[PDB]
C-alpha cells in the first residue's frame, strides 16, 4: 500500500475486532504519522493460534 491516504481513527471504531494489538506504535497516534510504504498480509488462522 502506497501513494495514498490511510485513515486509522475509525479503524478501531469500524467494527468488532477480537484482537487489535500494535507493536511500536500507539494506535491512537496513528492519525498524524507518515510512512514510506505500508504492507498488508492476509490469511485465516484459528482463534487459539
Amino acid at each position: 500500500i502506497s501513494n495514498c491516504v490511510a485513515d486509522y481513527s475509525v479503524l478501531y471504531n469500524s467494527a468488532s475486532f477480537s484482537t487489535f494489538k500494535c507493536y511500536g506504535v500507539s494506535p491512537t497516534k496513528l492519525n498524524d504519522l507518515c510512512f514510506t510504504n505500508v504492507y498488508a498480509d492476509s490469511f485465516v488462522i484459528r482463534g487459539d493460534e
Binding site: 511500536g24 506504535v25 500507539s26 491512537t28 497516534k29 498524524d32
Partner: protein, 49 residues
C-alpha cells in the same frame, strides 16, 4: 605543542559527548521527539528511561 594538546583534548572530549546524543542505548530511536509522537504515555515512559 604543549598548548595545542589542551585544546585538542577539550574539543575532542566534547565531540565524543555530542556524538553520544545519536545512540539508541536500547530504545526504539535515539531522538526523543520521535518517541513521543508514536507512543502513548504508559509505554513511552520505559523507552525514555
Amino acid at each position: 605543542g604543549k598548548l595545542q594538546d589542551v585544546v585538542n583534548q577539550n574539543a575532542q572530549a566534547l565531540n565524543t559527548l555530542v556524538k553520544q546524543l545519536s545512540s539508541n542505548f536500547g530504545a526504539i530511536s535515539s531522538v526523543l521527539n520521535d518517541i513521543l509522537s508514536r507512543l502513548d504515555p504508559p509505554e513511552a515512559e520505559v523507552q525514555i528511561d
